[PDB]
Design a protein around this ligand. Sequence first.
Ligand SMILES: CC(=O)N[C@@H](CCC(=O)O)C(=O)O
Ligand SMILES: CC(=O)N[C@@H](CCC(=O)O)C(=O)O
Ligand SMILES: CC(=O)N[C@@H](CCC(=O)O)C(=O)O
Lengths: 108, 108, 111, 109, 285, 284, 285, 284, 284
Amino acid sequence: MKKIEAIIRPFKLDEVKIALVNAGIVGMTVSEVRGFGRQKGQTERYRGSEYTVEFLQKLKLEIVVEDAQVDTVIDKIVAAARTGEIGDGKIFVSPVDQTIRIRTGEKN
Amino acid sequence: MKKIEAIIRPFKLDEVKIALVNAGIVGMTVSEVRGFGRQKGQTERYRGSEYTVEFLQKLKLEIVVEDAQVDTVIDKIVAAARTGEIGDGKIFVSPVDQTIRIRTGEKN
Amino acid sequence: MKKIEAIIRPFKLDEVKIALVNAGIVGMTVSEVRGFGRQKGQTERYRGSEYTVEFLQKLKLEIVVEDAQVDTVIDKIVAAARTGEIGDGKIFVSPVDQTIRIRTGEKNADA
Amino acid sequence: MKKIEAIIRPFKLDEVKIALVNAGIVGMTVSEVRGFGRQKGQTERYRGSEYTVEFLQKLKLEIVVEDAQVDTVIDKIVAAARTGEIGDGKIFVSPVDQTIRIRTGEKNA
Amino acid sequence: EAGAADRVRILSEALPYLQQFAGRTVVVKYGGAAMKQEELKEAVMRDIVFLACVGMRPVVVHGGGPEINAWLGRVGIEPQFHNGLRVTDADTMEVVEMVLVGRVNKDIVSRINTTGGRAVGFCGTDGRLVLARPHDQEGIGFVGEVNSVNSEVIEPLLERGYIPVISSVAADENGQSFNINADTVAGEIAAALNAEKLILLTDTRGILEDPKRPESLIPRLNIPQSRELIAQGIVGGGMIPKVDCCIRSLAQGVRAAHIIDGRIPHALLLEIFTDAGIGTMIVGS
Amino acid sequence: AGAADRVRILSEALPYLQQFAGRTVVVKYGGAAMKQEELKEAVMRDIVFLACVGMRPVVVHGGGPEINAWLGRVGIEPQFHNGLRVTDADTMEVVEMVLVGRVNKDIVSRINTTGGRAVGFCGTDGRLVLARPHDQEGIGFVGEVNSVNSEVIEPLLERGYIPVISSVAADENGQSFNINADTVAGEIAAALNAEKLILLTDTRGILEDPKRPESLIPRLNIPQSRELIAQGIVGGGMIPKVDCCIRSLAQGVRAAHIIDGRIPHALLLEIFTDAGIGTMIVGS
Amino acid sequence: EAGAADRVRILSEALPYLQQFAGRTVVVKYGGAAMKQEELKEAVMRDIVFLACVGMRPVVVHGGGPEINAWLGRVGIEPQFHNGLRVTDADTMEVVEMVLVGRVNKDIVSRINTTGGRAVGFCGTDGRLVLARPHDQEGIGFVGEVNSVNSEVIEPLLERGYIPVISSVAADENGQSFNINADTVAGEIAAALNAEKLILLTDTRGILEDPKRPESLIPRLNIPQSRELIAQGIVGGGMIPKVDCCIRSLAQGVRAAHIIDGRIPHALLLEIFTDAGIGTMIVGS
Amino acid sequence: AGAADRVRILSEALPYLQQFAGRTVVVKYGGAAMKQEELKEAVMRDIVFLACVGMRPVVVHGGGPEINAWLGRVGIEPQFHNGLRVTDADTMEVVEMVLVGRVNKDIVSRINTTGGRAVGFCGTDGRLVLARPHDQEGIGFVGEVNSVNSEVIEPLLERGYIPVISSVAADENGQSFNINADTVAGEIAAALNAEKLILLTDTRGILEDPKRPESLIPRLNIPQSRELIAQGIVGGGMIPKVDCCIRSLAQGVRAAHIIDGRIPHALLLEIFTDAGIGTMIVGS
Amino acid sequence: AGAADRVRILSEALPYLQQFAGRTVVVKYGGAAMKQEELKEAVMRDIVFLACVGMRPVVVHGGGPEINAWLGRVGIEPQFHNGLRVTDADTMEVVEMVLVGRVNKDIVSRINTTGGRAVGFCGTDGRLVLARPHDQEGIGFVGEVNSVNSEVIEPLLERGYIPVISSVAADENGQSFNINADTVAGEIAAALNAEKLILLTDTRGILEDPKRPESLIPRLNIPQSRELIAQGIVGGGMIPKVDCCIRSLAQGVRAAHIIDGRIPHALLLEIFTDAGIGTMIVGS
Ligand SMILES: CC(=O)N[C@@H](CCC(=O)O)C(=O)O
Ligand SMILES: CC(=O)N[C@@H](CCC(=O)O)C(=O)O
Ligand SMILES: CC(=O)N[C@@H](CCC(=O)O)C(=O)O
């Protein structure tokens, strides 16, 4: 089992969410995050201003997904979350051992 | 020489002012005043509410006028300042001995 | 006809008003005024502080009264409006020629 | 007995008060007033703006004075209260019958 | 039934008084009787914090002559009073401040805090809350009179539901400290705050129509009625300056002044929420 | 040398007064404390007292018995299907008229005369409550709470007003819906993040043994409540009442009280007294 | 020319520093050297009020061991200190409070007020500004340590341009008073206020790289560099707890801690607006 | 054991700093202190220092000499009629471009780089100043201040910004008017109820004797100013400059200063020093 | 029994009025709608109408053609290097004078007389826009937006004022820079988190097939737009205009509109009408 983490541009959240629900995803979590990654020496644009090394407002988006889904659900995210402009974000994939619903007890 | 004092309903001030300037009056002063006078036992209406003995917001209006004007300038005020509804106000006439402009010195 | 002007301490207004209506007065106007009429070389107390020459908050109270009433109407005011402490205020009496009610037209003058 | 009423420029109040206390005046009252005295079609200034007929902020200043003092008391006021610019104000003199101190009772009929 | 304490019924009966003085400001002179006796001292704090809790605005003003007396006899200085004020030189002044501002004030604050209020302790000199002048009385040393009160300091805290506790010690325009009478400060603070009530705790059941008769307690009297008693001699001793204080305070705007019997437990509550007579109320009439 | 010590007792209220100082309390005024004058008049006093002290009381109300009256005066017959009233288009019209018009403005009227400032509402006021058709099939225009927007009443609550809300809400279309009073109370309480949801009722609380009127449980959490339910101990229309509390507590509410509204001043006895008048259900 | 003093030119040169610390909060430990000597005492007040006037937010925290010492020898009690703290029983505590809260605190407030600021004097126990616990050190009586700081009381006043002056005396949850070290209180107040600078006035030209060499004054050192000196013995005596304080304070959020030579006139200004070395600045690195 | 005592001196500024703490100061930046770099750069520093300390400085500016340049670059000739510039429709266009465009944004630019936050305006911005045709006949689009509305700049002033206003205002129709800089300063100052109106100028103030560069009067009131004027002592284009002060002082302003803008840091010398750099005219 | 039933058509605007109620709109006023009076006068009325209703309109403007005039009146030739105008130190001075001085205050002047309260700005006012030298080498003092600080204008925006910003900004040193108008509009819009960035232009939008109007695409998203550049369909400068939109939309802006400023009341046509006047770029 795997944990997809998508650090995405604030406004995109809806476009991604709907894309995932359409792709049939059950449980997501979002958190407010500041981030940065710039080249190769480059500047990202945020609220009209150019920034080099300082942290900018983004959104960490966490789902846990069955191993086989990983490939095409990244495909679904990137498609929805991309502007092609500097600072679209990064996706991180990590292993997950166990998934417990608290209301029932269902372990996966 | 005489001092006309008109205690008038707040909104009327403009109608009175223009009436007096048209009647050819030079120097007026206004002050914010609370007042009351009720019958014969009656109730005046103010901001939707009925009042008996409590003070209500009005406007004291002070001019000084040449003795001969008095009669018809009261006529001009009352015409402009009347609604015919309880609490239109009162006019008071008093004697004035001397009138000094401060900017020049002109005494009347 | 006469115009009584009473410069009175802010809080007293009700006690005076009541006293005058009981004495049977119709016409009354109040205005917010700063004053000072102090005895030297003494000070007047206001909101906890001692003041000498500066203006303090008071209330001008204007009623127009028939010539005969003047004497005992002042008696009624002073009784109601006094604390006996420095800065109780001062009453002023002036002549009035004419009294016009705007809603009707009732002019008054005598005799 | 006489009642001097001075409608004066807001800022001047201190200069006038001073002048009167120095001239030896004991009782006095101020009230906030709007006024205007149309100077032959000309405009009066107030906070940077030109005004013709509208009411502007002033100060009514009331003292009651013994008949003999009237003349030179006005002289003291005008001197203190004048800028010479349009809208310095007006002084009004009226009769006063009686003066009662409330704390004591000292009448002046 | 099916139940034991109520209690609730008696609480519901406080409602009219609770409404009557809702959001009002009350300046209390905590002193002497209710200050020495623990049973009474602990009771006052619990009244003060209750008032605060309900939504009224209570302000404690305090002195502490007896409290001073102790420490003066521990630096080898002798107590002396001049027909009213405590005759205080430069050396004895230093002791007054230390006791009233340091030891007493923080005791009151400390208690309220532990009782569950948020007390903030002051003396005149704090943000020029009270500014002192030498008292008219000549020769009695650094005894002060209230020259001005500036509440710009404490009403912020009062809004925020804090309990100001003010000691009756104020500095002049130069920086020298002055021992001011506690009652007058209370009166002047009350006047400056436009307080609804000035309540003076005292070792007397109020003002008696007959000093010989303990049950002649006059319930109310206005200014003329009070001024009268001072001339007829009925109002005597050091009731005189106390009654003076009330009049002086009432004249300034205060709506009611109460001279209560601080000797009895929860004297404050019995005045505010009960019809039971614990002292004379003096109004502005 | 004096008589009434309402003082020593009021000083004893201080810890409770501090304990719930500034807190919000949603009360479901209904049935027992609503019909009997001596009690009805008592509640208003309690509500206004709470408000006066500095707590934030909110009255939510229904009035089945009250509706029953007027139906029988237009020639329509009362009709209940497992707790909720079978309300067609014609009977709905009456529900709305009684609850919003006659009952709500009685409660407001009383509080105002008692010395509080009551402001009366129903769900449809500024979309305070927005209704959906209740899951239950075929019982007509019976509603369930779809959403609560308190942007309307929060302002008034800060200004020390006492909101009184009837349990009638319009859907997105404009159709009125008869919603259960308790649930609305629970939902309002949840939306306001209330410290206490207090349900007035004709039962001394939740009895551990129905046969013994003395088993009265004092304190319960969610699992202990759910259990039984399952054990049958909680039965009848205590069940939806207990459901409500759980559903409300889950959402954020700190405490839910099912108290005996049948006894004078039931409220102040719960708030300021250790005396048992009902079961408290926590999230804890 | 045509004119004499300027003055103006030197004033215009303060602009970069004035901008640099504009609107910032500064907690100063007024004590010892700058407290006893008038020339210096009067100078500090004039610095404090200047800072306040400009738009910075200055907070005075004070002790007064020497000041205490006097009065204790006037009730027949003896001074005693345990390798740091002053060994204070129930009887000596009473004296500490009276001196620090009553006599010293109001002196500082009094001076500032006359200098043209608006000082408001506090001690820990005021609105639970500082709440004390018994200091870890066993057997040294009622010596306190800062258990918590609540600034909900003083930042209202700080916004309103007032000058808080806090004595280092705080009550516990029970109501008993505790003598807390002045420096730590300053540090903890500074931490709670998220202060830009914690400035400790002291009788030393700072931290010397060689104690034998008066001109080895280290200008800056971060936490590791400071912690080092404590092990190498260079930082010794009662510099140790002072340096401890700075570290403890800096760790909490404070941007800079200054150990300045309070012995020289206008020590504060020379630190804030001048490049001239008057002490060691310790940062959080 | 240390070197620069910029400390003992700054401690000496404290009384003045307290004296004008939070007060508003309208300065007419012009001519001498405007052309010479060493001075121009000095003014900005003074202005930003004042702002920094907590006073409220407002720069009002013109720039006759500055306009003269660009006119002679479109082939138009400078033309003055008794103080005011004879400005037709074509010359107006340049005035506006120079004062609002080139000069105003130089002053703002400098302040910003100096570390203040300048915000540049002209009369027509949010109707800050509204112009009427100047009483004077036939000198084209020369304006007089008809009204001042500070509802625009007050907000920024509180937020610690430094307004810089050019003396160009539009009438009710949209026509631009070249208004005298001094009068605008005076009017702005009056509208803001400013503590001080400070006019920078190429004169050491008002000399009691023109022949003696040392008679410098320190302090004058309105009657003493008007006099002379009448005695001829105040002459040239000091006359309208003195008129301005009187007109401004009459309206509420506490003090008007005619200082020698020719010397470095003329401003801070007036505010924080007892040294005479010009005549102060009071209403007193 | 009467006459102009313009009411029925007014009631029909309600859904759109609700749809952007309180939203912010940055409009690039330029070229076509700027030269022709009938169009110019129409825009102002649209802008003030928007403001009046409760939306927040911000005008950003350039004025190449306007600059061209005055350049040819100091004896300097216009020259363009693909899109940006090459501007030396001497030509910059003119740009600044024209845009900030003459054009900006024309727009402000008109709005004011139309009944709005316009407040005119350029980048350097309170550091609203701070410029850097544009990446393009050798083009003189042509600027690129380095940062936008709206702390200056959002106070005025809430107070119902209409900001009008010229596209001229100073660097950290004080040097003025000629920045492209569109980009400034985009970056202002981004900084304000604007609902709409609307670019007035002399084109009916983005034509699917240029051959070959009207094939104007109603809506595009970023990928669709990006592709059209590669396919050559989006050409000329179009290209930088479309770039602007993308760059602006990426930053947070919800919609960018390239509309035909050539037609009367182009703005209201876009906001309150379903009628196609340009291509809307989102978003998705
Ligand atoms: C559905 C339903 O039962 N509604 C309730 C109204 C509110 C209440 O419960 O009192 C009723 O009896 O009509
Ligand atoms: C009318 C007039 O003289 N305007 C001035 C502009 C402002 C100034 O005085 O500097 C000018 O010289 O054009
Ligand atoms: C670089 C550049 O294109 N500058 C434009 C200004 C922008 C505009 O007017 O829209 C110019 O014509 O100078």
